[PDB]
Amino acid sequence: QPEPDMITIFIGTWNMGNAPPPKKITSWFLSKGQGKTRDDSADYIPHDIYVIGTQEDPLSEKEWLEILKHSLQEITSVTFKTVAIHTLWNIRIVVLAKPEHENRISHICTDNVKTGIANTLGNKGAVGVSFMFNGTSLGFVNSHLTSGSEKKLRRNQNYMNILRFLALGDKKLSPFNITHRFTHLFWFGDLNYRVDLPTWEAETIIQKIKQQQYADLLSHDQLLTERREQKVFLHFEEEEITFAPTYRFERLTRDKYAYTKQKATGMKYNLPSWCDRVLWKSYPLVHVVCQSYGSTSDIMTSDHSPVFATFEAGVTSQFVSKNGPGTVDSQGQIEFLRCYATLKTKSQTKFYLEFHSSCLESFVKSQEGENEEGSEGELVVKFGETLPKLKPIISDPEYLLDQHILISIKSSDSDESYGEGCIALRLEATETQLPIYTPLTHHGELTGHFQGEIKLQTSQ
Ligand SMILES: Cc1ccc(CC(=O)NC[C@@H]2CCCO2)cc1
């Protein structure tokens, strides 16, 4: 029975509005409704992994698991296995997988982050799950960010706290946050970004939604505009939105948006918005294709509609050779030529690199680089031909060309990372000097760049 090189992943996000779900929620898991929807011919084909994020979830874990499993069994005639479930307040993540994957899944981690301080600590934050699927690391984050049209900067701060403090994946990757720890990272939830148009325009917005004309609304969506200005979700992807705003509906129909200020809303307007979103970030040159992104039309217990997204994702096998794991394969090596880091820092410490990868027995520290002043004020750290030769555990090109090297640039004075990035080994050639590049981030914000050349030697 061969190991897969692709799987499909279902991502769901639903703010349930503290109400129990209706009897039938299968449309969610079938990717049926508005937007980029799934073909009817696929309805019986189970996804490999289902990741369900809820917010304002009033159910017990047991109650929700029974609904989810019975839903999937009705669609697919498969009894899914529970990989993980984690709840913070009313924010919940459930991971289900096909039974045939039970012995492919390992290193399961869960964690949560509470956002805010005092007043603003007690219901917003995030839950997450990570695991290995054979040779591939997967991370999943469900966040419920701060509400209200005038709080986009708070949402952006919530995002930065969650990616700094959520403790998922390989703890040995100590310089790296969740935005670098996984082959594929999916981040979804009630992100709560709004369509920033004047309150007076509410009926105009409703008109536009009825005409399925979303362009003038999406051009004011706070998540798209903040992402374009590099304020949040740097280096994440989102599929184009082709479904109506998923908030704020009158319950028990989808015919009416309830936007007017009420005591129940703290006298705030809730103009129709795309609160409910799915984004992802995968390592460079790994296959990931979004195959659906949309909302349901027939699940009306909440003031939000459920959102679905599905993905094809490349996966790799748990590789064994005669040599590694448990030794190196002298027939493999990774060399770096003419490398330099460009950093936005004002500081003047020396810097060194760390190279982390599951193709190495352990991480590798470089010598300190040579600081020069760049022509436009920047710090340039030169490594020249000084970087250590990396010794992979396995030399087979079928394994090595699928790997990635994480890079941290660290201060010699504090050993703190000033920037993190990732290089793919999926090269156009072996035994050939080829340009490499990554942006560098710290706490998910841009801090610099790393560029140079690589020379990869495989057994072929
Ligand atoms: C209109 C707009 C443009 C950019 C972004 C951020 C982003 O990461 N987009 C993914 C790629 C990256 C290169 C351009 O598109 C959001 C919204």
Do 10 and 117 fall within a single domain?
yes
Cα–Cα distance measured from residue 202 to residue 281, given in angstroms and rounded to the nearest whole number: 34
- What method was applied to determine this entry? X-ray
Strands across the sheet containing 184-190: 105-114, 125-133, 136-144, 184-190, 276-282
- Which amino acid is residue 130, in one-letter code? S
Resolution (angstroms) equals: 1.4
Cβ contacts of residue 284 below 8 Å, gap of 6+? 404, 422, 423, 424, 426, 438
- Same domain? For 166 and 234 the reply is yes
237 C-beta closer than 6 A to ligand 1: yes
111 secondary structure, DSSP code: E
Q: Of 276, 301, 325, which residue constitutes the final position of a domain?
A: 325
317 shares its domain with 351 = no
Co-location of 131 and 94 in the same domain: yes
Q: If we measure between CA atoms, which residue out of 238, 247, 151, 154 comes closest to residue 188?
A: 238
Ligand 1 pocket, residue 328 CB under 6 Å: no
CA 227–ligand 1 middle distance (angstroms)? 7
CA of 235 to the centre of ligand 1 (A): 8
Residues 156 and 50 in one domain: yes
**CA-closest candidate to residue 427, choices 450, 451, 458:** 458
Q: Minimal CA–CA distance to 157: which of 167, 168, 145?
A: 145
Residue 342 shares a structural domain with residue 394: yes
CB 322 within 8 A of CB 45: no
User: Nearest CA to 16 among 72, 90, 78?
Assistant: 90
**Neighbouring C-alpha atoms within 13 Å toward the C-beta of 120:** 14
Q: Residue 355's domain spans which residues?
A: 326-460
Residue 215 Cβ < 6 Å to ligand 1:
no
Pick the closest to residue 278 from 92, 67, 10 (CA basis): 10
Q: Do residue 297 and residue 382 come from a single domain? A: no
120/140 same-domain check: yes
Q: How far is CA 142 from CA 80, 184, 188, 373, in A?
A: 21, 15, 5, 42
CA atoms of 75 and 378, how far apart (whole Å): 57
Residues 6+ apart with CB under 8 A from 388: 355, 364, 365, 366, 367
Q: Is the CB of 231 under 6 A from ligand 1?
A: no
Which of 282, 306, 325 is the last residue before a domain boundary?
325
* Same-domain check for residues 237 and 95: yes
> How many domains are contained in the chain?
2
- Both 8 and 122 in one domain: the answer is yes
293/154 same-domain check: yes
136 vs 146: CA distance, rounded Å: 32
Which residue, 291, 325, 359, sits at the end of a domain?
325
Residue nearest atom 3 in ligand 1 by C-alpha distance: 228
Grouping H, G, I as helix, E, B as strand and the rest as coil, residue 430 is coil
Question: In angstroms, rounded to a whole number, what is the distance separating the alpha carbons of residues 11 and 187?
Answer: 9
Amino acid at the residue 207: Q
List C-alpha distances in Å: 147 to 125, 252, 355.
Answer: 12, 23, 39
Whether the link from the prior residue into 198 is cis, omega within 30° of 0, is no
Together in a domain, 360 and 428: yes
CA–CA separation, 260 vs 274, rounded Å? 17
Report CA(232)–ligand 1 centroid distance (Å): 11
Q: Is 65 in the pocket of ligand 1 (CB under 6 A)?
A: no
Q: Is the CB of 160 under 6 A from ligand 1?
A: no
Using a 6 Å cutoff on CB, does residue 228 contact ligand 1? yes
Q: Which of 72, 11, 30, 26 is nearest to 239 (CA)?
A: 11
Sign of the dihedral through C-alpha 371, 374, 377, 378: negative
Q: Which atom of ligand 1 is nearest to the CA of 230?
A: 6
